[PDB]
């Protein structure tokens, strides 16, 4: 009989039951989407949108719901933090129900197809054998794809007859769903322009519509039919797996490197924003501009929003988690309550010292305090190691500007060392770890988890492309040679 | 050793399978509240 | 404030008898299909 790894090949030559099993997989996927959305809603806390966002709570499908318009909830709250008066049926609770509802319909259809495995449509008039005109089916499906694609771009991403998409500022402080106009110039090609999404979907939809018309009207050349084995479903499977792992690699790259389709308010900061100090430079920039205005240091650091300072924190780096460090980032370093303010360290002489920030590669980094010219003035010695530049010996003092500790000066070594350890992590934040019993080991943002999962999926699907392409190109010689 | 003459096949019809599944699920529903306490 | 093994007991006492019944039914249907 059939081995365990070939069982589903029973529906290889039965179009009706192939449609049934594909309907079952779609039902399972839609049910997973609905159930995951409901679970995330049951766990989501919309109390603090700026310091406890969705990407700090382990939300996975909620960012994808919020990307393309679903932001309100039936509980009278929104992810932007505005209080929605009348949510509307399309709310995360409503959207979760819609996916579950679709799953129930798909299961019933799959059973009907499975029972009626024998339909005339499926049979070839000529021979009376079950057959599938793929070149045509491709055309019909491609044409359908083009229409849906063009449609999303023309009515949805733009907002003509839809909600638009999520668009934020350069530093993810003010972002919301809004209509985006198409950009037909070269400026629509950089990944960081939301208008490029609308222009892309419109143009690609039109081209796909034309391509579907062509692939419907025109039959394939005999050479391509014999070379690509177009009468075999397995070559379609291999080509589809190839295109899917191609798209998986592309989406993995866009998620990891960042794009207009991966907003930082929905998925969190990227690692390259921490590597280049993307938020730190802006914060310094704003502080300088405020100081140039005459505003004092305390006033200049008090103008800095908490969200921007929270972005300049290494705990939000997606490259600081662990493979088996499970749960949200709040489970990792606690839930952020408030910004403590920017610390400034001064030795006995009065030189300004900066704690070198931790590179993402290091699980542990030496705590070193350096002056303007980069000389090391103070350090926390490796444990129980004799030192000459200890914070106690060099008498560093810490003065906070902005945040809760604004205006406070700390001279005691224990407090100064504690703030110095915190300063190597970027902006100093206060966390509560009792509500979720947090272990203090950094977790990963949903961006990193998506990148990991879909990169491994893309590699395994490259393996699948190889296997199924070999299978369809060597069908005659399988089960032994002569 | 050898072939034993007492070996008999076991049968569970579908009605019996559904009766068993219903019994197990109903007992789980009943005792879940008490196990969770 | 629910227990913890509580989940283990519920899930296993649901699954262990369910998979036993499913295995027995599949074995019986296999015998019926083989003989027929």
């Amino acid at each position: 009989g059939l081995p365990w790894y070939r069982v589903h090949t029973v529906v290889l030559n039965d179009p009706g039951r192939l449609i049934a099993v594909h309907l079952m997989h779609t039902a399972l996927v839609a049910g997973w989407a609905g159930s995951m959305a409901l679970y995330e809603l049951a766990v989501f806390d919309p109390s603090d949108p700026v310091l406890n966002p969705m990407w700090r709570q382990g939300m996975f499908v909620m960012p994808f719901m919020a990307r393309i318009g679903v932001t309100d909830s039936w509980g009278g709250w929104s992810i932007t933090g505005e209080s929605v008066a009348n949510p509307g049926f399309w709310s995360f609770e409503g959207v979760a129900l819609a996916h579950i509802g679709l799953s129930g319909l798909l299961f019933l259809a799959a059973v009907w197809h499975w029972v009626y495995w024998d339909l005339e449509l499926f049979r070839d008039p000529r021979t009376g054998n079950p057959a599938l005109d793929l070149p045509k089916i491709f055309g019909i499906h491609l044409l359908l794809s083009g229409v849906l694609c063009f449609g999303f771009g023309a009515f949805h991403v733009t907002g003509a007859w839809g909600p638009g998409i999520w668009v934020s500022d350069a530093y993810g402080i003010t972002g919301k769903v809004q209509p985006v106009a198409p950009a037909w110039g070269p400026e629509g090609f950089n990944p960081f322009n939301p208008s490029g999404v609308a222009s892309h979907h419109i143009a690609a939809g039109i081209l796909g519509f034309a391509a579907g018309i062509f692939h419907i009207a025109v039959r394939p050349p005999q050479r391509l039919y014999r070379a690509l084995r177009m009468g075999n479903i397995e070559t379609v499977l291999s080509s589809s797996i190839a295109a899917v792992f191609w798209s998986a690699f592309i989406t993995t790259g866009t998620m990891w490197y960042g794009s207009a389709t991966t907003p930082i308010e929905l998925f969190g900061p990227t690692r390259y924003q921490w590597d280049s100090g993307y938020f730190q430079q802006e914060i310094e920039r704003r502080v300088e501009n405020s100081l140039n205005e005459g505003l004092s240091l305390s006033e200049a650091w008090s103008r800095i929003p908490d969200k921007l300072a929270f972005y300049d924190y290494v705990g939000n780096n997606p490259a600081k988690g662990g493979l088996f460090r499970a749960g949200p980032m709040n489970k990792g370093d606690g839930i952020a309550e408030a910004w403590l303010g920017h610390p400034i360290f001064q030795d006995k002489e009065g030189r300004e010292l900066t704690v070198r920030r931790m590179p993402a590669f290091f699980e542990t980094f030496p705590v070193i305090l350096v002056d303007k010219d980069g000389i090391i003035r103070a350090d926390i010695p490796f444990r129980r190691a004799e030192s000459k530049y200890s914070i106690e010996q060099v008498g560093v003092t810490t003065s906070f500007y902005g945040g809760k500790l604004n205006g406070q000066v700390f001279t005691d070594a224990p407090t100064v060392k504690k703030y110095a350890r915190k300063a190597q992590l970027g902006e100093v934040m206060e966390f509560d770890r009792t509500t979720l019993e947090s272990d203090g080991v950094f977790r990963s943002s949903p961006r990193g988890w998506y990148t990991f999962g879909h990169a491994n999926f893309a590699l395994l699907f490259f393996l699948g492309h190889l296997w199924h392409g070999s299978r369809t190109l060597f069908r005659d010689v399988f089960s032994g040679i002569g | 050793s050898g072939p034993n003459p007492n070996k008999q096949p076991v049968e569970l019809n579908r009605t019996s399978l559904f009766w068993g599944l219903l019994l197990i699920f109903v007992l789980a529903v009943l005792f879940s509240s008490y196990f969770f306490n | 404030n629910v227990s913890v093994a509580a989940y283990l007991a519920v899930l296993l006492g649901t699954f262990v008898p369910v998979v036993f019944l499913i295995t027995l039914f599949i074995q019986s249907e296999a015998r019926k299909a083989a003989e027929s």
Partner: peptide, 30 residues
């Protein structure tokens, strides 16, 4: 989280009822 277990058990029971109704052994005269 126990609510998830309760809901899972209830829908499993409902699905068992559905399969018992629409996938029963069809009675025949012997």
């Amino acid at each position: 989280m126990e609510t998830l277990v309760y809901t899972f058990l209830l829908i499993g029971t409902l699905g068992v009822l559905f399969f018992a109704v629409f996938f029963r052994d069809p009675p025949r005269i012997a």
